[PDB]
From a paper:
Interestingly, the two side-by-side DSR2 molecules form an asymmetric dimer, with the one cavity at DSR2 C-terminus closed while the other partially opened. Comparing these two cavities, we observed the structures of the C-terminal domains of two DSR2 protomers are distinct. The C-terminal domain with opened cavity rotates upward and thus moves away from the cavity center compared to the closed one. Additionally, a long helix in R1 of the HEAT repeat domain of one DSR2 protomer with a partially opened cavity directly contacts the C-terminal domain from the other protomer, which facilitates the closure of its C-terminal cavity. The interface 1 consists of the contacts between the last two α-helices from the C-terminal domains of two adjacent DSR2 molecules. This interface is primarily maintained through hydrophobic interactions, wherein the hydrophobic side chains of I981, V988, L997, L1000, M1001, and L1005 from two DSR2 protomers form extensive hydrophobic interactions with one another.
DSR2, a Sir2 domain-containing protein, protects bacteria from phage infection by hydrolyzing NAD+. The enzymatic activity of DSR2 is triggered by the SPR phage tail tube protein (TTP), while suppressed by the SPbeta phage-encoded DSAD1 protein, enabling phages to evade the host defense. The protomer structure of DSR2 revealed an architecture that consists of an N-terminal Sir2 domain (residues 1–298) and a long C-terminal helical region (residues 299–1005). The Sir2 domains of two side-by-side DSR2 dimers contact each other to assemble into a head-to-head rod-shaped homo-tetramer of DSR2.
Residue numbers in the entry:
A (entry chain B): 6 to 494, 504 to 565, 577 to 632, 644 to 898, 912 to 1005
B (entry chain A): 12 to 493, 503 to 566, 578 to 626, 644 to 898, 910 to 1005
The structure:
Amino acid sequence: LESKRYGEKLKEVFLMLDNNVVECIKEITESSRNGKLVFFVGAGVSTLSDYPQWWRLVDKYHEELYGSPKKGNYSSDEYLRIPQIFYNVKGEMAFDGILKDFFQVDKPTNPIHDKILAMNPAHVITTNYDNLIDTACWKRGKYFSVISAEEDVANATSSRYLLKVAGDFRKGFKGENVVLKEDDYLNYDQNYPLISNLMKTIIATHTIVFIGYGLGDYNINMLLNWVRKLQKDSFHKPFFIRTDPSPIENETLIYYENKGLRIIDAASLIDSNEYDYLERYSAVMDLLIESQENKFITKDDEVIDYIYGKISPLFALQYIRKIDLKHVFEYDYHFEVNGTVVRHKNKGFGYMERFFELKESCDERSKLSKKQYERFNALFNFFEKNGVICMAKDAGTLNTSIEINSLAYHGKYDVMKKFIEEQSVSIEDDYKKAFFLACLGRWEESYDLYSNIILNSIDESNGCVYYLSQINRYRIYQSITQAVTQFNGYKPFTDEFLARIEREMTNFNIDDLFNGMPFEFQKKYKILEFLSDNQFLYDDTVKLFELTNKVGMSSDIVVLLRLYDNLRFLYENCLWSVSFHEFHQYIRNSMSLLIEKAEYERTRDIDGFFMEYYDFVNISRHFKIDDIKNLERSCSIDKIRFGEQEKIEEYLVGIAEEITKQFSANGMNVVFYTQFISEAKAALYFAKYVKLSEEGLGKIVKALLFYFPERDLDIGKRYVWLERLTKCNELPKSIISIIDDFLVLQAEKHIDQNYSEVSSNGLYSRDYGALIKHFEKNFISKRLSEITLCLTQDKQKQIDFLFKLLPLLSTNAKSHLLSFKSVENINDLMNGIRIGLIDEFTPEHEELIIEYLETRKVNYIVYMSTFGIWYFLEEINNSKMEEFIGMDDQYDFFVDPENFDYKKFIPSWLKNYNDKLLGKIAGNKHMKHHVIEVLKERVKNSNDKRYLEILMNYFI
Amino acid sequence: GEKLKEVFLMLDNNVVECIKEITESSRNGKLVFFVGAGVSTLSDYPQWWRLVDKYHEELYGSPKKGNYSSDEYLRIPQIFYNVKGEMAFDGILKDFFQVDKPTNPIHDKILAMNPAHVITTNYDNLIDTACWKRGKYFSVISAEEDVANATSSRYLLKVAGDFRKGFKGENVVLKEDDYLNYDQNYPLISNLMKTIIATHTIVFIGYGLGDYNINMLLNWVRKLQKDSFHKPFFIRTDPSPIENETLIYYENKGLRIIDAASLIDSNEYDYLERYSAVMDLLIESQENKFITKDDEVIDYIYGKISPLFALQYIRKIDLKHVFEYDYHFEVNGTVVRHKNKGFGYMERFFELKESCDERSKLSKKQYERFNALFNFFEKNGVICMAKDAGTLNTSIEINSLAYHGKYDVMKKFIEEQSVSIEDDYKKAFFLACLGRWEESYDLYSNIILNSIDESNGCVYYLSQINRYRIYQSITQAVTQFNHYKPFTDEFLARIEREMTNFNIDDLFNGMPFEFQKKYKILEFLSDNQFLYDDTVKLFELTNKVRMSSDIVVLLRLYDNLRFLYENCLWSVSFHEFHQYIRNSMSLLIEKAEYEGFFMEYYDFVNISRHFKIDDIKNLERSCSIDKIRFGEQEKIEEYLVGIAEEITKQFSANGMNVVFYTQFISEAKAALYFAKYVKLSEEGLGKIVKALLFYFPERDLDIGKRYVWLERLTKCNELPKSIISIIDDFLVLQAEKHIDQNYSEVSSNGLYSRDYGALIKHFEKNFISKRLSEITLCLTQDKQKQIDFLFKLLPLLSTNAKSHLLSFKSVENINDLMNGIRIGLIDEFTPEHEELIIEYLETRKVNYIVNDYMSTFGIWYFLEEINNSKMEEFIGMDDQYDFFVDPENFDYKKFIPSWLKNYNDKLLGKIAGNKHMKHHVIEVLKERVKNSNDKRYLEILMNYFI
């Protein structure tokens, strides 16, 4: 109501203002924004809080000295001599008693004591000897180190000095702690030598505003005398706020403006009464505050100039996140991840709304100055590149697609190398090369290049490429230090280099990296202060909590877009913090929680989340095989599907091609190797869910099982990867040839007798042959057959290994191998030599195993589980079956099943049985309900998962 | 390397304290290196004696035997300037000083100490080049016109001038005239130099004890007060050792002379050796040090924990940050060394624990410090070093009346007068937990105002943060409140005028530089870095498990709760912490099923305050909390009794606080719903049931949800006589409220007050209600709504009440027909009930051409009670009914795989006995248990179908 009227009054006052006062306000606001504003409030400020004046105390001194008050008024000297006459004649204790009974009072702070601190002054120099400004600072939440005496100058903890040049009363209401009289003003430079120098240092290095003074004060003229001693242009002219009832005469204005003061009169700027001081004090102060709050921005040239002044620093950076953009305009607007802007704290003009109004209409944009037109063009290009498209009120359709156009993210190691081995056009060109060297391993060269960038950019404006290079040098140093903490302590780095980085990065304080910047990289780029901190994704990891709660931007889309923004900020701006454990943990948690939340919503069918190329790259880079396995044993990835299968295929091919460039060619790069092999393992493991072309699967499989390292992927892991790949494709014959080539290579490596495949899952070359047969039963491995035909009798390792691959051979090959059969096998057909030599259990086998089972009767009444499985599968069929009853429990279970006691049937057999056998036990009469009941009793009173995957899969 | 610590051993007491102060100032960013001409000489920069001799050579013959005096050092250049001119002076300056000397290592040892400023008396560029090479930005200030235009806060202040504006005699202070009117030509440079000298630690290097600059500086320091200034740290590296009389003379003049000739035996020309000796001493002293004896283990640890004595409890995660990541204080009480490459002070300290032989050697003041440190480590739960011990007793105990729900003792503390600011700090948080946010904000502001002396500053910072969070709570409430608005608009004006432009991220950065060093762990309370480590561990452990992991989650959660509730921080009542508690406890309880989690009193209060009813239902569906016991069931019972008494005091005793209500009604509802799992005494049962059925407001718990809560209560506690009487009183109250024709049970799930009669009967089957029967015998035949109520409670009435009621109420509507099915005395289905079902079906057909019971009519048709084959002619849209009356036509794809949860034993057995529906239902249940984690479907599968 009345506040709005006061705002309109301030607006029209600013509109009807000369260029001198608006320039004074502009400089005061720019000092308040650079953190260089220092207020020099005086006695007039505290009087508005009704604090006792000094004419009252000099009146008391005159009344207690001469018996009566003054016959008129006191001059400047009589304000300093009558207290001195009282001190010299009466004494000290009476002086302090009067000071106590006049100054012990407690008065509340006036609103101007809060308007003063609302401008965020660097220091507050005060001539007041009262704790009113101390009270305002303490209530406001700003710790201003109070410096009352010279014992406080050295003991001033913080760098925010609340300097009381006249003294204070915190050490008692005595005259020795304040400057009040003669012999205390004459003796000020020899009783107060350290706050005088501190006041004269704050004044010379900052911007000074004199608030509560008249242009006749001792504490104004003594400073005007000191600046007269100074040189010309050696110091900034201090600002002076004048709030006297009468307007300033032009002669006095000229006199005090040539003396050093930039007077901002209030009686010549507002209309008020003689005794209305709080109106004048709260007029110019309100003018500065509302100017800082952007309440006086009217022209579209000032709209463009404000946004340009806040954004055009960030032109050096290749991407700025929406969170960073919010931090730019002091939380006035919320730039959302989808690109819509909403006003949050802007209490002044809508400069962003006006900017987008200029964007939509070309005719109003033409109604602008040419320089401001080009500034608008620059801002428009910036905002359309970063994704800020318009306000939410005017938001219509908007596609949220990400584009991280950095060669480091997309793989592209060969293009990265080609870019590295070139001539650097500029320093920002060398910054990309340094980050790229860090990406593909060469951390020594990356550290050296970052040092060179720092050296060349020490003396250079807009020092992002200096600051960011220092940060990435400290992070590549941390990466080297951690590399030789866990890989050592092969040999990645030399010892001369390590000593050099420890002799260079000895006391590099990353905390003080931002505070060591030249005060322009403190305001223009305060959005980059978060990079020097050790942890910077804490505002994002706790946003993942909105994902895990169970009951146009939901929680799913906003965290994925914020993940993309963090990814596009580190990869496009080439920041090495993208490889640390914090960012890897962030990506892991965010993608895992996104997939888990999608699975939770999908499983609410009791009453999604397609992932594109940029998601596949993240689950290949920042995930591990265990983490993807943890997602596999939970979320149904078979439904979360995949998109952009052409770019995922080229990603996997570039990963597969680099695999056959690091093992086929001479690639050690052991620090690059550990990261890249994790990426390759995760990518080729996650490639089960993407459809690949014939040549795509051809190159990837050929990499997987010819050029992948043996140590990282054994033959079992290679088979698991291969089977996961062959699920989705149909395994074209060009790739079955590749698997056959692997088998012939392993057979030829088995020519050397002292060789044995080491597998971690027990899954071997026989199962590669099984995969070949189970997609193509009509297949004869020709080269394997040539090995069979030209194989000697005494090459035992080849004999057994290539026996394990019998179906893949010809009939002549089979007979050449079976030239060394066994007929002494007591049961040696499936102990280690199980391939499928069974086919028909002829009496050459059947009767001989029956003789062995007679020997087993001899061993029992005075190898079995396979007899039971074999007979129940009708593989043994003879009248000699029901001879040797009374043997092991499983014999009674399988051989005489319609009389068996299934209570003795051990529960764990079904966990180690054969799946086709469980399929056969499903269809029968008695074993049907008995395995039903034993498996049900396992489901209730036991704690595993094997029994549940049999009851529900087979039977019913 | 080791010779440096040998020198450390040989250091005198006066030297070893000087290095400690210098290193401390370097770590506090208060070091300023006053470099001189003895350091640039190590680079072989042309000394002024060569140029004085050159001025002598071009003007005064050639040499001057005697090496000149200081007056002769400053007069021959002045005589040359006066007579031979200025251009010749500048020409000789250009001939000598335009050189490219390489920077000596001391230039890099100075900047390796991280000096705040560098006040050089040299006119050279070697320190500028050293800063440029190292990577330090120093705003070089050579002239007066650069003081105001200083780019950075760090100053490379060249007091004597510099040749960066040309090799001229005007830009430097070299002659006698330049040294006489120096303060007339350089006022701002002098003021800056004196301000830096007064407000920093000056470490003069490269000077002699003569050195006119040093003499003028000491003369100026003489004019200062007695102990106003700090004493500068002169580094003397002259060849001869300093005479003791000279050191006495200069030490009383201001300088703290660190000698080098009395520090290392070197030649008469090994200046680099002495400079490097002192500089390397300082640099190697930066890394911890000063901790060799047992009386220094109790001052370095007391130098990092004695601030933390005002905090009532701190986290072990915070304890890791306290000791600069030297040790990783684990949550079970072990202290794993992480980056303590120097002396093992934790090991030594825990060795001085017990072991009275070691403690007796310790000094008496160090003994009190050790007792304080031991009490601190005992209170916070730190036991000892990692490899030592291992028993590691659990059970963190949060002692706070806010956590335990003591809403009456908190009021007592609030009402009583307080004797300390920390008592008001507890009182303000107690007010905040009690809803009274206005008095909370006012008392917090009073604490900030009255924390003036308070040299710790942790009762001002925590109160400022808590006032910010209570202001956020008030603003978010009045935003959400749009009940009533409890805060007067004057209060909103006060909180939005005082607490505007107050950013919480500027509070810590702006504190005393001591408070930013000690109480550093308090800086996470502003932003969300407070939970960052614990949230990361929670996410990683949620991925992993699905000193053992389950214990790691629990102990970290209890650490976070004991940091917030015991320190009385309002950050506990915010969203992020609530989600942290909820996710951690959900992870623990889910981990229990994979195994076991005992669950204690401290768990029950956590799953009541921070969980919601929806999350409770999620945990009950997914996992099983039934077999998971709840340990201490007497402290849980007192908690539930306190909650019942609080809702009683809130509703039946008129006075209620809406801001307190909004927080407490989300916890009372959760605890009384989670009270199923705890055994409750008859007294506690009666209290919380008579507070649930009568005093819980109907806007937050209607009849149906009240009944859900009540059936949950009567599972582990049965339904005794006193609770039966309570439910009877509830039914009586409902009857006298339903005497009015405009009253109706508004239920959100469909379990009306008839179900309460069913619950009473289910545990009794013979509870004749005397008062309800008395209510029945007032039949006026116009008070229908009442007759219908007691019709729904017909089994609860007596034989006379049944006789009077059934003489008026009969079966003439579908609703009272299904009510008759529920209450009984229908059983036999005479044709009128079947055709009544058909009439309801007709009224449904009227909608069909264009709250459902067609499901239970399909149920009845499957249950072979009704047999009218015309019901198939009225096949509708509810596919339960299509399933039940036409199994073959019903496609089971549209069968929502719910509806099996709410089926009885007999009906599920009936679906078991029909081929098509049976096999389709195995398919449905199978896919349900593979995709969904609910166990009810699995129970159905192997109770009726497997």
